[PDB]
């Protein structure tokens, strides 16, 4: 439920842990659009 807090953890670690922009985005976007998109796009 708390997608934001979980994304914050990865955001704290940095950009490198995600490596592939499109990969992380596809998974985050399919779950929730707009509201969660802004966060994952800002993160990396």
Report, in Å, the least distance between residue 44 CB and other proteins. 13
Q: Which of residues 20-39 bind other proteins (CB under 8 A)?
A: 34-35, 37-38
Output 12 or 42, the one with its CB closest to other proteins.
42
Output 23 or 41, the one with its CB closest to other proteins.
41
Buried b (16+ CB within 10 A) or exposed e, 3-42: eeeebeeebeeeeeebeeeeebbeebeeeeeeeeeeebee
Residue ranges that bind other proteins, judged by CB under 8 A: 34-35, 37-38, 41-42
């Amino acid at each position: 439920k708390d997608e934001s807090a979980l994304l914050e953890y990865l955001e704290s670690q940095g950009e490198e842990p995600n490596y592939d922009p499109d990969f992380a985005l596809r998974l985050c976007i399919q779950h929730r659009r707009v509201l969660s998109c802004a966060h994952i796009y800002t993160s990396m």
